[PDB]
Design a protein around this ligand. Structure first.
Ligand code: COA
Ligand code: COA
Ligand code: COA
Ligand code: COA
Ligand code: COA
Ligand code: COA
Ligand code: CA
Ligand code: CA
Lengths: 164, 164, 164, 164, 164, 164
């Protein structure tokens, strides 16, 4: 059938623990990436109701730092779907505990592929964008889903050229 | 002044813990993304001898699943430098315990920027690619750095349209 | 200077990891308890915009199991205030991965107290219930608070007769 | 077939790590709650010699702060039994590192239910209070149990009026 | 002055989590070692009431495996003291959750040195063994404290001979 | 048949997280002990291609503190073999971030034994020391293996006298 983007929306707001802070009192980029993928993998399975796997991560720019005085929240939902794969948009917002001042520290698209119990890609519902914002994000996702093939190709190129 | 690429090479092999396996008995991409950033940040500070901050992560294609029957290894090192930014390359290899066979699970570049105590971009030594493979990876790190301005324009755009 | 209950509302959806499961593939009650306080503390500072300390945890009944086949969601918000304290409501929703089925696995009230950098209870804004659900939860909260002095006197006595 | 309360007694002393401290260098209540259930579940299986599921957590008052300057100790034991359930008592003692000073930081009753591999409540041995402390805690437990059906009916109703 | 060995006794019983189990369903030796040192460092500070550091680990033999069906408990206390250092005995016992069958999986002595806020070794109370068992363990500790110097010496020898 | 030592060499560099720092801003010995075992177990299975179990750990002298201002690196590899047991050598190097200077923080040997699915010691390839340094470390691993029988008699004794 077909599912609304909001059917797969996932929210997660966390505290900023010292473990994840580097020397400059800002999160390690990895912490954010690990979390983006995590919250997105949940969106992937909510939409597909299948056991998903992460195929790719779109480039990510860390627009602002997220410090200990901050608070991070992630939001994610599926916006674009292929036959077997789906693109999950992820939004990361930091919030000052005393000010309330929020600001988006990073965003990205994570691609997931639904698999059968025997590693066979499996059809996935279609997404249907409601909000005006969701429609814009879907347009962007459409364009990002086109370069996907070039990227993969470049990735396979670097691989073969490499030593283990 | 000048610093060999290998003078910042960083290794790391770990087992695959159940904690990080999805419902398909494979690693969450997030786990790998975090390790790539982690290991890469060490390379960055080893080279700059200033503690660094991750500025952005390049696109990442998860070429092969990493299972509990494997163990992952991460290799990373600087292969490009600007004034205060460094392009760090990272490769991920999966190794089958009993068979002994390896596979590049993924690769990428993570851009780090060196900062002062007062959080200001500070100069960083130039990197000197020795090996043929290093030269080729540097040849590529260059193309990536050349597109960093448009990649950022793409991100700043999405952030702009987002409402939170 | 009166905040709407929704201004302190906090969400979090997580997967159910093996580490938090006993031999019945059900979460340890403790895991849920920990996440309730966490999520409720973020609500407390969202609303008080001060760092908060948890004063007491209302009694908690684990109505249903939370298996590896589910994902857990936590929702919380300030629903009652005194002078320097807040009663934060928290609801735990268990959702079935492949079937989309949901149930409340538990609910509770966590009481937080705002403190100054000198460990002194500081005044906190008043909370305003909007929806019917919020108005109802508020009454339940009013009742809970009407008896906290008793609960505490009971706790103090037990500590009294204890040899450590 | 009647076990002494002491046969299920469990101890644990831990340091206070930065990760579990809020901005007041006091433990998150949740951390303590988690450790109480953990330690109490080990007592439950020590006594029932079956894998146990946590049914409910009695109300909990955090009488004192637990700072990084302390170490926490947890003690627990079965102090009441029904047919298939047990009420496990738990006391949290905070001890000052350089001064040796101790205080009860919290106490509580955690209720566990023994289950068969088919998720069925199984009979558990009867517990025998020995010391005066144990006999007293037992009476308090008897009272707690006399009202659990009410507490649960109250929890079920809240879940009822909740929209998720 | 002088303190009884029991003044520093520390108990800790834990569950065996999957994360720490290797491929053969037995704990990684590291998990046990990390824990022995941990519980022992607590004994060290309880006795010395000083901030301690771990100087050495005596060899450790893993007599039996500790599986998921097991339960581990550590016990530690100071038995031998120098002027500035102290030897902490550590006992590790696994217990079958269904049988109750206990057995000691490993034991060892960990040496700690009390330090002043400026890294200067600092005098430590004297230990006084009460139990007959404690007296035997103290005799053994006395002999182990003699070879300490040879060991250290061999350690320094291997170090200098090594490449970084 | 035959396998080079380096064919099992394993590297690993990590940052020093606050979680593992004692009250003296230095690593808990336990943290290091765990990493030495971890890294060494990988070396063991890389060599034997059978998953291994840690049999014993050699004495360990903590020659230098490892601070938050450093980052630790672990190198390990097999340098001695018996029929089914392997002597794995492990070195720990601390590296000062800003200065760039290194120090051997500790070193040791960890004995691993290869097991079948049915938990039976299974034969393991011989190890071939190449480098001069390897030969010297093997020359030593031999002396250690020669005393393993008395080291075990010492441990079995302590276990015998212990009452639990
Ligand atoms: C390639 C992989 C993603 C599975 O797909 P596949 O074998 O290539 O098979 P298919 O060709 O049928 O792929 C189906 C979908 O893959 C998607 N896809 C494959 N590679 C992709 C890439 N790197 N980036 C984005 N999408 C990709 C395509 O969009 C295609 O979508 P569609 O049907 O919607 O149009 C796979 O090799 C894999 O399992 N890798 C990751 C598994 C994992 O464990 N991930 C974590 C890393 S350890
Ligand atoms: C990167 C950052 C430090 C500096 O931005 P700035 O204040 O704009 O820095 P400047 O413009 O003075 O100079 C920036 C240097 O960083 C580079 N840079 C800035 N943004 C970048 C980006 N998104 N990707 C790659 N490099 C970037 C610039 O190219 C420049 O490089 P160069 O000197 O070699 O030529 C800032 O974006 C930041 O703190 N981001 C947050 C990073 C972080 O802490 N987050 C981790 C997770 S929250
Ligand atoms: C509760 C506590 C936080 C405040 O201290 P206090 O001495 O009771 O201070 P006050 O008398 O001013 O109480 C202030 C508020 O605390 C509330 N409160 C106090 N004890 C409470 C109890 N334990 N349970 C619930 N609420 C409590 C009171 O209602 C009062 O509310 P009000 O302002 O609306 O009227 C104090 O008990 C404490 O510091 N405990 C610390 C617990 C902690 O740090 N938690 C972490 C776990 S270690
Ligand atoms: C409580 C539960 C465990 C047992 O189920 P049940 O349907 O109530 O089964 P029973 O009627 O036989 O109850 C058996 C025992 O449970 C006790 N009990 C049931 N519900 C309880 C409640 N929530 N609080 C405290 N004790 C409870 C009853 O007193 C009874 O005790 P008894 O044998 O001495 O008389 C069930 O609610 C459940 O499976 N919840 C699972 C919670 C869980 O798995 N915990 C992990 C967190 S997700
Ligand atoms: C050597 C070290 C242990 C401190 O002591 P020191 O500088 O050698 O100074 P001292 O000579 O005065 O040592 C005092 C005690 O050290 C003890 N000691 C030192 N090295 C020891 C060793 N490896 N094994 C057992 N005991 C040792 C001695 O028993 C002496 O004891 P005593 O007074 O009771 O008789 C130190 O170099 C160090 O800080 N290392 C570990 C610190 C740390 O952070 N540990 C975790 C590793 S990262
Ligand atoms: C080591 C162990 C597997 C085998 O003991 P066993 O049943 O006595 O083994 P066998 O006697 O058949 O043969 C033992 C091989 O292991 C070696 N071994 C046994 N105990 C050893 C010890 N304490 N230290 C080093 N090697 C030991 C023997 O030397 C022999 O080596 P070899 O074949 O090369 O010459 C057994 O002690 C064990 O399972 N221990 C627990 C290890 C573990 O799982 N624990 C990890 C933390 S709990
Ligand atoms: Ca929608
Ligand atoms: Ca004594």
């Amino acid at each position: 059938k077909g599912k609304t983007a909001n059917e797969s929306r996932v929210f997660k707001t966390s505290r900023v623990f010292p473990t994840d802070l580097n020397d400059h009192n800002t999160l390690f980029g990895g912490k954010i990436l690990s979390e983006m993928d995590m919250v997105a993998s949940i969106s992937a399975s909510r939409h597909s109701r299948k056991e998903c796997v992460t195929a790719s991560m779109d480039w990510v720019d860390f627009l602002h730092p997220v410090r200990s005085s901050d608070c991070v929240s992630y939001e994610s939902f599926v916006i674009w779907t292929g036959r077997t794969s789906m693109e999950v948009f992820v939004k990361v917002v930091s919030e000052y505990l005393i000010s309330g001042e929020k600001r988006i520290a990073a965003t990205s698209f994570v691609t997931f592929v639904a698999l059968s119990k025997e590693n066979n890609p499996v059809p996935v519902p279609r997404v249907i964008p409601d909000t005006e914002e969701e429609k814009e994000s879907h347009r962007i996702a459409v364009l990002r889903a086109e370069q996907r093939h070039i990227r993969k190709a470049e990735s396979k190129k670097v691989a073969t050229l490499l030593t283990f």
